[PDB]
């Protein structure tokens, strides 16, 4: 149960507990008043650095809810292949549309 | 009126840029309504191969949407993307929308072939190619005004110590940094370290070697010092990108949970299950920023933005760099004068001045560095927050380029080249050649 | 290049390069490399009209 | 030259062996690319002989 | 014998390496990509300048002077602005022997 | 301006290569999107009469798509095929592409 | 011949028809689920044919 | 089942015992490490001839499982016919699409 009005409260394990969809409404629901009584031990700008992590960490965590909706990312480039000594390697920019019934 | 006779002379029929592909370009630079999703994407892609082929699909959607709405080709403000949109995405874009992206690349490569018509064969001199003593664009002594790599900076420094290659990066000498992912942020630092985040895949990385073709840097210069000032008439300005807030409002994700008994909803309006529906909108997320932006992007493709986890970017680093004049021009009387032209590692070029939307602030993501006198707005630099009210008049008259990024009389491109961009009615296709003639060296 | 008294440009690769690409074949330019003392001399013409 | 070795490496051999030969001095028939008719008649281009 | 011509350069693929399928040979000076020859693997760094002005044709495939088309017919291709239908005829008029 | 003014003087009205047929064929040589599948088939056909009537259905499905995506001609880099694309495929390729 | 013959051609059921559309038809050779990394079908789609 | 990190292992039968559906996965799933202890007796390029035979052999088994989906191949040209002395011979240019309901 993190509080965004207390800067020292924000951590990764607090932001990970509330998922992406909760993060969607977690940004608006806060209170306009900010509390400076307890600053951040690493500094207050560490909260914006912390903010990119939770979303990026939830990106690949979001596609897990979509795990049945997507495919495996292929090599998008040559030089990435299992064995090059029989066939050469293409790479696949995914313009296809991952979806599964 | 002289030069446009010189320039229009060089228009012997080398190459022309189709009139449709012109109006559909100006139609970009001049849109007051231009989707801010496009600016944010460039910040995400930030030039890299690996990032682009990952996000390759999102691009294909955004263009055709914007190409069918306003009928103006997008992503024009960066040549790196325009160089990819030709090579990678072959058949996705309509028959029509490609031709606009072929000509730019073509009509660039047409200008690069003037210089080798006008140079004689000859041995190298200062360690420089013989054409490099003729034309400015072939000079390594310059830099493109926007660089995503350390690669160019390698070559420029490598120029003869006679040509004195230093960099003040936030005020210090060049250092080049390997790659940048989630763990490494470091968006504020003034040190010399410079990312190389643009790499084909995860397997090949270095700071001391380029992965790309030989002419890559030249075509950039030809693009920014010729085409953009030909189309834009100098109404655009460079701006530093703040990577704090970019990925954030990018990694805000409303992607609805899909039920297996359903299909994949494609409709931004009627489908309650497509992330672009007005019910899924929560202020200032991506799918909600598509509402402010009017772009169609699919919920499942929204996922591929995950690859941001696999590559990130640092900041916008101001660079001075110095050079002494040529091996050919260096005389005991000349040797002590230098040329200072600044550049920006990891920066972006704005086009049109949207200051009047209280729904979009000026200083949220992109902050305005007027790099070079070619790049300054009247309505950009004036509409920034905290602009002194006294200079509002004079700001119309002169470029406000701050001396830390270099001044006029020391630069290698003076003022009078600029107004030749504004004051010449020759047209889009007859300026480009007229400019290329301007850039030969004395 | 008949004349003298101008500071040579600094790269002996280039300063020799230009001169050879100019003085060569010119109706005028010095034939023998400049005699240090009196004057340069014009190549003699085979016949005049 | 005589064709030698496989097709794939026939170019890399050449290049690697000729790196200096191409880099010693300019090549005649290409050096004349830019010659105008009237420049081609002057004493400047030595190829008249 | 059993070769293939490559119309337009694509070197930027990191999705397609250059030496995967087709190894480039510049048979005759009319066919040498200034692009193609420059982007081959291990292309000497110094020659990148010079390789733009001149074609690079391996002497195992025959040299300029000893071929049946010397240099300039190439440049009459690049330089002539006469337009496509007007060029080709000029070429068929170029090959009348002496 | 000589080599043309003669060749152009041979342009007396023998044959006009139609401007629309000029716009296409450039687009082929100028494609950086030109798909490598088209190269592979050539290596396959390798000039064979038989192999082409074997794959004759592929080429059509390959061309007409390409013609519809970029509106340009394809398989331009070998004349043998272009001679096959005529004497065989009459009504398959669109009214426009033939 | 290698990467023309590295093949995903899925078997067609006896009552099912022949797919003409590469996207939603699982039995099409070029179908994305049938596309496997750097293969013949993934080649046709890599080149969009 | 042949192991793809030893070149000497791959033969005609071991690949032919594998079908077209399993051909594509085994090539991407192999090990990135190669053994120099036991190479192929006839050399590396001698096996290059060996793998391309399997693909054609796999094309066959592919088009053998797909044989019931196609029609009887006709000659694509004249000159191949049983009776040329009553009527002459065509050959069928194949633009058609064999499929069986």
UniProtKB/Swiss-Prot annotation, chains A, H:
GO term, biological process aspect, one: viral process
Please indicate if the UniProt record lists Transport as a keyword.
no
Its domain of life? Viruses
Where does the record say this protein resides?
Virion; Host nucleus
- Pfam annotation, one family: Herpes_UL35
Entry GO CC: host cell nucleus; viral capsid
Q: Which InterPro entries does this UniProt record tie to the protein?
A: Herpes_UL35
Going by the UniProt record, its keywords in alphabetical order are:
Capsid protein, Host nucleus, Virion
What HAMAP family does UniProt report for this protein, alphabetically?
HSV_SCP_alphahv (MF_04020)
What role does it play? Participates in the assembly of the infectious particles by decorating the outer surface of the capsid shell and thus forming a layer between the capsid and the tegument. Complexes composed of the major capsid protein and small capsomere-interacting protein/SCP assemble together in the host cytoplasm and are translocated to the nucleus, where they accumulate and participate in capsid assembly.
By sequence similarity, the record places it as follows: Belongs to the herpesviridae small capsomere-interacting protein family.
Assembly and interaction partners: Interacts with the major capsid protein/MCP.
Write the protein's name.
Answer: Small capsomere-interacting protein
Species of the source: Human herpesvirus 2 (strain HG52) (HHV-2)
């Amino acid at each position: 149960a993190p509080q965004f009005h207390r800067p020292s409260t924000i951590t990764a394990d607090n932001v990970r507990a509330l998922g992406m969809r909760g993060l969607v409404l977690a940004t608006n629901n806060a209170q306009f008043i900010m509390d400076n009584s307890y600053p951040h031990p690493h500094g207050t700008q560490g909260a914006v650095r912390e903010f990119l992590r939770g979303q990026a960490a939830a990106l690949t965590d979001l596609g897990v809810t979509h795990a049945n909706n997507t495919f495996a990312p292929q090599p998008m480039f040559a030089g990435d292949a299992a064995a090059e000594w029989l066939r050469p390697s293409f790479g696949l920019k995914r313009t296809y549309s991952p979806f599964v019934v | 009126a002289f030069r446009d006779a010189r320039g229009l002379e060089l228009g012997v029929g080398r190459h022309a840029m189709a009139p449709a592909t012109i109006a559909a370009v100006r139609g970009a630079f001049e849109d007051r309504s231009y989707p801010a999703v496009f600016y944010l994407l460039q910040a995400a892609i930030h030039g890299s191969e690996h990032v682009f082929c990952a996000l390759a699909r999102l691009v294909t959607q955004c263009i055709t949407s914007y190409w069918n709405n306003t009928r103006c080709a997008a992503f024009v403000n960066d040549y790196s993307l325009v160089s990819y949109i030709v090579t990678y995405l072959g058949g996705d874009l309509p028959e029509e929308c490609m031709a606009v992206y072929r000509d730019l690349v073509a009509h660039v490569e047409a200008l690069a072939q003037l210089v080798d018509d006008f140079t004689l064969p000859g041995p190298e001199l200062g360690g420089q190619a013989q054409a490099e003593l003729n034309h400015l664009m072939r000079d390594p002594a310059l830099l493109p005004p926007l660089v995503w790599d350390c690669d160019g900076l390698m070559r420029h420094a490598a120029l003869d110590r006679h040509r004195d290659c230093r960099i003040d990066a936030g005020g210090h000498e060049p250092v080049y940094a390997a790659a940048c992912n989630v763990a490494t942020a470091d968006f504020n630092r003034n040190d010399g370290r410079l990312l190389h985040n643009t790499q084909a895949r995860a397997a090949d990385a270095a700071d001391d070697r380029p992965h790309r073709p030989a002419d890559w840097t030249v075509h950039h210069k030809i693009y920014y010092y010729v085409l953009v000032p030909a189309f834009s008439r100098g109404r655009c300005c460079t701006a530093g990108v703040r990577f704090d807030r970019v990925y954030a409002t990018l990694q805000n994700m409303v992607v609805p949970e899909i039920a297996p008994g359903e299909e994949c909803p494609s409709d931004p309006v009627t489908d309650p299950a497509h992330p672009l529906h007005p019910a899924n909108l929560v202020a200032n997320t991506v799918n909600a920023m598509f509402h402010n932006g009017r772009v169609v992007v699919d919920g499942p493709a929204m996922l591929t933005l995950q690859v941001l986890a696999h590559n990130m970017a640092e900041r916008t680093t101001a660079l001075l760099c110095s050079a002494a004049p040529d091996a050919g021009a260096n005389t005991a009387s000349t040797a002590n004068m230098r040329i200072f032209d600044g550049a920006l590692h990891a920066g972006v070029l704005l086009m049109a001045p949207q200051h009047l939307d209280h729904t979009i602030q000026n200083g949220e993501y992109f902050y305005v560095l007027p790099v070079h006198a070619l790049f300054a707005g009247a309505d950009h630099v004036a509409n920034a927050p905290n602009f002194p009210p006294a200079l509002r008049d004079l700001a119309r008259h002169v470029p406000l380029v701050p001396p830390a990024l270099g001044a006029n009389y020391f630069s290698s491109i003076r003022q009078p080249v600029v107004q030749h961009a504004r004051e010449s009615a020759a047209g889009e296709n007859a300026l480009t050649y007229a400019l290329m003639a301007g850039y030969f060296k004395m | 290049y008949l004349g003298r008294g101008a500071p040579p440009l600094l790269d002996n690769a280039a300063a020799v390069y230009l001169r050879n690409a100019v003085v060569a074949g010119n109706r005028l330019g010095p034939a023998q490399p400049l005699p240090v003392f009196g004057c340069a001399q014009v190549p003699r013409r085979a016949g005049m009209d | 030259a005589a064709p030698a070795g496989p097709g794939a490496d026939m170019q890399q051999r050449f290049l690697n062996a000729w790196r200096q030969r191409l880099a010693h001095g300019r090549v005649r028939w290409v050096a004349e690319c830019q010659m105008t008719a009237e420049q081609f008649m002057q004493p400047d281009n030595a190829n008249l002989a």
